[PDB]
Amino acid sequence: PEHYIKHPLQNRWALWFFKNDKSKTWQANLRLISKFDTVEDFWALYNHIQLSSNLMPGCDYSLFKDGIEPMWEDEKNKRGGRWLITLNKQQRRSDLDRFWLETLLCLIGESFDDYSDDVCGAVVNVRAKGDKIAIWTTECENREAVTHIGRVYKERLGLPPKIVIGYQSHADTATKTKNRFVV
Amino acid sequence: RIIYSRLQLLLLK
Ligand SMILES: C[n+]1cn([C@@H]2O[C@H](COP(=O)(O)OP(=O)(O)OP(=O)(O)O)[C@@H](O)[C@H]2O)c2nc(N)[nH]c(=O)c21
């Protein structure tokens, strides 16, 4: 195999940044950082930007398929939901960056086999109360696809069987949250 | 579909 060709990704992805320093409306604080559709370009971007652990509390990164905005209101997210990884304060140091990188690799590598098309993106929230990472999927009622994605993710993060993770619909998250599924 | 294992992605860094 020749080596002058970049390694294309199945999807083009968009990286977004959030910091609550521009507007009192949530959506106006989102910044598109960049888009990429090869492995080499992914790494160029990843190597240029801060580790999640070095961001100020209140910031997010989001990696979404190009065409899907990183918000509940997108056509591909409104009926969807997320698998949620909740981290304690000490895990900012031990696990946040490695879990986020593994999440990015899961996404860009199409690691969910028959159900990769149900994946919309992923979000990391750096927060003083405890950081969160999540994979967002398009349809909270597809039990088979959602459960499969969760099991892949748990395996890729190396979480043991006694650590249970939960899936919440965005419709439930947005209302004033219960798990629809656990793995 | 274009799939990459974890190893493949890291080698290409
Ligand atoms: C992901 N998202 C977050 N927000 C707003 O940002 C707030 C914080 O949502 P957050 O997901 O950033 O979590 P945080 O840990 O800061 O607080 P919590 O999850 O509410 O406990 C939400 O309550 C919404 O007001 C959102 N507002 C809209 N309209 N759409 C979105 O997709 C969206």
Author numbering:
A (entry chain A): 31 to 206, 211 to 217
B (entry chain B): 2 to 14
What text appears in the publication on this structure?
It binds the 7-methylguanosine (m7G) cap structure present at the 5′ end of mRNA molecules and recruits it as part of the eIF4F assembly which also includes two other partner proteins, eIF4A and eIF4G, to the translational machinery for protein synthesis. We have used a structure-guided approach to rationally develop a set of hydrocarbon stapled-peptides with high binding affinities and residence times against the oncogenic eukaryotic translation initiation factor 4E (eIF4E) protein. Crystal structures of these peptides in complex with eIF4E show that they form specific interactions with a region on the protein-binding interface of eIF4E which is distinct from the other well-established canonical interactions.
The lifetime of binding measured in terms of the residence time (RT = 1/koff) was also found to be higher for the 13mer peptides (∼36 seconds) compared to their 12mer counterparts (10 seconds for sTIP-05 and 6 seconds for sTIP-06). The essential interactions made by the parent 12mer peptides were retained. We computationally modeled the missing functional group of &13 and subjected sTIP-07 and sTIP-08 complex structures to MD simulations. The “ButPhI” functional group of residue &13 in sTIP-08 was observed to be dynamic in the simulation and did not form any stable interactions with the protein. Conversely, the “Lys” chain remained largely bound to the protein surface and significantly contributed to the binding energy (–3.6 kcal mol–1) between the protein and &13 at the C-terminus. This physical association with the protein could be the primary reason for the relative stability of the moiety and hence its resolution in the crystal structure. In summary, extending the C-termini of two stapled peptides with tryptophan or effectively lysine resulted in the efficient engagement of a previously untapped patch on eIF4E and an increase in the residence time of the peptide–protein complex.
